[PDB]
Amino acid sequence: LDRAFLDGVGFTPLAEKQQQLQLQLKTNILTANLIRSAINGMNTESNLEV
């Protein structure tokens, strides 16, 4: 029933989230901050099932 009724999903794409993270975490590029590196490899192909 949930699958049949919950048709779409609402979320913000990755680009905006990365921009916000960059603005909030004002750090020079070329410094190897793993907080920024880890998120850069994400995606939301699977959001409906989750």
């Binding site: 990365q18 960059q22 590029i29 070329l30 920024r36 850069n40």
Partner: peptide, 12 residues
């Protein structure tokens, strides 16, 4: 081969 060159992947 002699001069290593790296680049930023997707932060660009």
């Amino acid at each position: 081969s002699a001069t290593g060159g790296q680049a930023i992947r997707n932060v660009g």
